Amino acid sequence: MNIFEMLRIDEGLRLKIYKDTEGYYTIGIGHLLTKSPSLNAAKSELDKAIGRNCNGVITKDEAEKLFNQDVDAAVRGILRNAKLKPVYDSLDAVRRCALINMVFQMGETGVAGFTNSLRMLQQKRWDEAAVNLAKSRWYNQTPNRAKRVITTFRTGTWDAYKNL
Template sequence: ALKQLAAVEISKKKKLSEQRGVMLAGVLGVTTTVFSEQYTVQKGDYLGKLGNVKEILKLNPQIKDPDLIRPGQKINLPGKKTAVPKATPKVAPKPAVTGTESFAKDLAPHEGYRSHVYKDHKGNPTIGIGHMFGPDSKKRFKAAGLGDKYEDCVGGKCGLSKDEATKLLSQDLKDVYVPRTKKLITNFDRLNPEAQSAAVGSVYRGGLSGSPKTLGLINQGKFKEAGKEFLNNKEYRESKKAGTGVYKRMDSYAKAISSATLRPNK
């Protein structure tokens, strides 16, 4: 019974010590928990000798004058410090970029961007990243979350930011160019993402749709031959000779096509 009583007393003292330590950590604004230990003052002791004066005074509010402590007096001294782990702030994961959003982000850096309406080389009113105004434009603006800007953009009263233009490009790809690419490439949905993006980008520019031989090789699964054939055209040779950016883009598309893989059928 005596042993049980002693154990209970020790447990109580330990809990009290921990509570004092947590309170002290909160008061001092530190990231450690300070446990206190009871000490009997000896002859010749002074607070500076026993530890950090500020911490001792925090644990012993009964001490009014730090210079007046006496032998035999019971005081609390800072004990072992245990690190209190800081809570890791939860960061909401960024939504995954998939499908046409991913294709648009890949394609946008290769295309010109104009914030306000302008006329292209054929005289067609155009805005953003190659969006040519037509019968379906209002519907696509709305689907891209830009419906309230349509009328003003048509009239030249407002423009599109780069992000807004990329959203509109994504909608154009979804409504027109991805379906067009799927009609040309029978196994499009089984291609790896890089090859899909290259195919859509090439159809957007007109290169792939104008090369029946390349399409035939892709549909036969002969990707290395298809990548090589893709560069066998006049536009590529002229661009490389002139040093324009078109051939670099075509090189990247050819590389993606050459290394294409097919996912297994579900």
């Protein structure tokens, strides 16, 4: 298992513009287009993203291209971030994937706000961090996905994803 396989379990693949759990316009493998209520603003972001007139529909190919850019940008954001970098560097390979997952879902900013859990992860207090992470909007709004990521941090194995 690797970061792409993991995120693809969590995000799914949709080739036509769709709304987020949050009601936001998205496409592909969880590629958020706009937080704006117009399908028209979304379409325009889509064409700008792909470099063609898409009419709200992309190919697999275009979907995976956007996925590659997003994962790359997630990793780079982690590495550029003063709060995130230290925790990332301290972690093993599997747990590294769990933090990447959070960053992809919520952005750098969102995750850098989990102060206390970050602290506990650096300290390698796995059970404690799992309990603290659960106390969030994140867990309450997307419990199955949060629980898969949380187990990953807790155990350091890919078991939550075996099932899936």
